[PDB]
């Protein structure tokens, strides 16, 4: 496991450019924000709904905890 003994690669050509010759942030807001959005659209459907379902169970459970904490109308009413 070293550079030279990794694997057999053939017929590939890699064109590169010096970091001083090229830019650091090439088309960052131009090409990026769309690419970021595309990536968000790809994942969102798989990622979000469980956290939404958590939020629903969270607020509901806290709501129902506050309901059960509070008074009830059958506590000695219509019973003097």
């Amino acid at each position: 496991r070293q550079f030279g003994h990794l694997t057999r690669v053939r017929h590939v050509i890699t064109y590169s450019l010096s970091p001083f010759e090229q830019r650091a942030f090439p088309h960052y807001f131009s090409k990026g924000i769309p690419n970021v959005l595309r990536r968000t659209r790809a994942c969102i459907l798989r990622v979000a709904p469980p956290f939404v379902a958590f939020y629903l169970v969270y607020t509901w459970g806290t709501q129902e905890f506050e309901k059960s904490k509070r008074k009830n109308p059958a506590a000695y009413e219509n019973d003097r």
Binding site: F3, G4, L6, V9, S16, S18, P19, F20, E21
Partner: protein
């Protein structure tokens, strides 16, 4: 210097290299340069000149690199570029 001194006199031996030297010199330099003028410029060079000139063209400069063959080990360009200046 002596390697280059010997190189100039070794190369201009026979007519074809001298005819090349003439034909090339006039297209490039404009005139034919005599061996005495070359020697003047070689004798001009000392240690300080080599350092000032080598450092001018090499030190902290992005180099053009070309690799063909089993080149999995060929260092990354950033590492090559890091090698183009020193620790100092």
């Amino acid at each position: 210097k002596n390697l280059l001194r010997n190189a100039l006199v070794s190369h201009l031996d026979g007519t074809t290299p001298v005819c090349e030297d003439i034909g090339r010199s006039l297209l490039t330099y404009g005139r034919r340069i005599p061996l005495a003028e070359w020697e003047s410029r070689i004798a001009e060079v000392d240690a300080r000149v080599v350092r000032e000139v080598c450092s001018k063209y090499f030190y902290d400069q992005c180099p053009a690199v070309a690799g063909f063959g089993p080149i999995e080990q060929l260092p990354d360009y950033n590492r090559i570029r890091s090698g183009m200046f020193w620790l100092r």
